[PDB]
Design a binder for this molecule. Structure first.
Ligand SMILES: Cc1cc2nc3c(=O)[nH]c(=O)nc-3n(C[C@H](O)[C@H](O)[C@H](O)COP(=O)(O)OP(=O)(O)OC[C@H]3O[C@@H](n4cnc5c(N)ncnc54)[C@H](O)[C@@H]3O)c2cc1C
Ligand SMILES: NC(=O)c1ccc[n+]([C@@H]2O[C@H](COP(=O)([O-])OP(=O)(O)OC[C@H]3O[C@@H](n4cnc5c(N)ncnc54)[C@H](O)[C@@H]3O)[C@@H](O)[C@H]2O)c1
Length: 271
C-alpha cells in the first residue's frame, strides 16, 4: 500500500519542481517530487489534476493531465506546451500558467489538486464514464478504442495507452490519430513510436500535420473523414472514440466526421 498524495480533491498540495526536459521548441516535460519517494500521486487512469497560482495578481487555475501513473513512485510528470508572449499576433500576452511554469526554477513549488474528470479506465477494456458531474458512471467495456488527439491533447490518450500496454492480459486495441501543426510539433514521437514497435498488435499509430515536410508517409491537413475511416476502428466493432484537442478541432474536424463515418454520439467522449 503506497501512500497517496491526492487524498481529497479540494485540498491543495504544494509540490517541488525537480526536473524539466525539453520535448520540443515550445513544449516541456515538468517533473515534480511527491511528498516522499514512496508516495504515488493517486490518479485513476483518464483523470487530470489542476495547478493553481496567483499570477500577476490574478488567480489562475488550469488542468493538466499527468502522463505518469500510480506505478511511478516519488514523482509526477506533466507534459506542457508553453504559449510564449510576443509570438502569436492574436495572443501577444501569451499563456498565463504555461509561462509561469516555464519561469519556475528547480526547487520552486506550485499547488496541485485532484484527481478530476468524468472518465476512468478500469483496465481490460473497461471504462467508467459519468454523463456529467452529478451522475453515476456508466460502465462500458470494449475491444477497441479510437483516439483523436491534437497537440497537447495527446496527454490523456498516452495515460490510457500506457495503462493498456503495461498489462499483457489487457487485449484492448488502441487506434490513435495524432494531429499537430508541423512534423516538429509531434510531441512524444519517440515514445509513441516505441509503443508501436513494442505493441503493434494492440496499438495503431497515425499522424496528420497541418503542413507536411517534403517526404511524408502519413496524412496532411486538419482531421478529415478519410483519416477517421482509415485510422480508427469501424463503427461495426463498436469502439469507444475518445477525443482531446483544441475545441474547434473537436467541433469542426472530429464530430461532423465521426458522424459521417457512422460513430454514434453514445460511443464518443471528449476529454
Ligand atoms: C481537462 C483539461 C486537461 C488539459 N490537460 C493539458 C495538458 O496535460 N497539457 C497541456 O499543455 N495543456 C492541457 N490542457 C490545457 C491547459 O489547461 C491550459 O489551457 C494551457 O496550459 C494554457 O493555459 P495558459 O494559462 O498558459 O494560457 P491562457 O492564459 O489561459 O491563454 C489562453 C489561450 O490563448 C492562446 N494563446 C496564447 N498564447 C499563444 C501562442 N503564443 N500561440 C498560440 N496560441 C496562444 C492559447 O490557446 C491559450 O490556450 C488541458 C485542458 C483541459 C480543459
Ligand atoms: N479536456 C482535456 O482533457 C485536454 C487535455 C489536454 C489538452 N487539451 C486541449 O487541447 C488543445 C491543445 O492545444 P495545442 O496548442 O497544443 O493545439 P494546436 O494549436 O497546436 O493544434 C493542434 C491540432 O489541432 C487541430 N486544430 C487546431 N485548430 C483547429 C481548427 N480551427 N479546426 C480544426 N482543427 C484544428 C489541428 O489539427 C492542429 O494541428 C488545447 O485547447 C487544450 O486545452 C484538453
Amino acid at each position: 500500500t503506497p501512500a497517496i498524495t491526492l487524498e481529497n480533491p479540494d485540498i491543495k498540495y504544494p509540490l517541488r519542481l525537480i526536473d524539466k526536459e525539453v520535448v520540443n521548441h515550445d513544449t516541456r516535460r515538468f517533473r515534480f517530487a511527491l511528498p516522499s519517494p514512496e508516495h504515488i500521486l493517486g490518479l485513476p487512469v483518464g483523470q487530470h489534476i489542476y495547478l493553481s497560482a496567483r499570477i500577476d495578481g490574478n488567480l489562475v487555475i488550469r488542468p493538466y493531465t499527468p502522463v505518469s501513473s500510480d506505478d511511478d513512485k516519488g514523482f509526477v510528470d506533466l507534459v506542457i506546451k508553453v504559449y510564449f508572449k510576443d509570438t502569436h499576433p492574436k495572443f501577444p500576452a501569451g499563456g498565463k500558467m504555461s509561462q509561469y511554469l516555464e519561469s519556475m526554477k528547480i526547487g520552486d513549488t506550485i499547488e496541485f489538486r485532484g484527481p478530476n474528470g468524468l472518465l476512468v479506465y478500469q483496465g481490460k477494456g473497461k471504462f467508467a464514464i459519468r454523463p456529467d458531474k452529478k451522475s453515476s458512471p456508466v460502465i462500458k467495456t470494449v475491444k477497441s478504442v479510437g483516439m483523436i488527439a491534437g497537440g497537447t491533447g495527446i496527454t490523456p490518450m498516452l495515460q490510457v495507452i500506457r495503462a493498456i500496454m503495461k498489462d499483457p492480459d489487457d487485449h484492448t486495441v488502441c487506434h490513435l490519430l495524432f494531429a499537430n501543426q508541423t512534423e516538429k510539433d509531434i510531441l512524444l514521437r519517440p515514445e509513441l513510436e516505441e509503443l508501436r514497435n513494442e505493441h503493434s498488435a494492440r496499438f495503431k499509430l497515425w499522424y496528420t500535420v497541418d503542413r507536411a515536410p517534403e517526404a511524408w508517409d502519413y496524412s496532411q491537413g486538419f482531421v478529415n473523414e478519410e483519416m477517421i475511416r482509415d485510422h480508427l476502428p469501424p463503427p461495426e466493432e463498436e469502439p469507444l472514440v475518445l477525443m482531446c484537442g483544441p475545441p474547434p478541432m473537436i467541433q469542426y474536424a472530429c464530430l461532423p466526421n465521426l458522424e459521417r463515418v457512422g460513430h454514434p454520439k453514445e460511443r464518443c467522449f471528449a476529454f
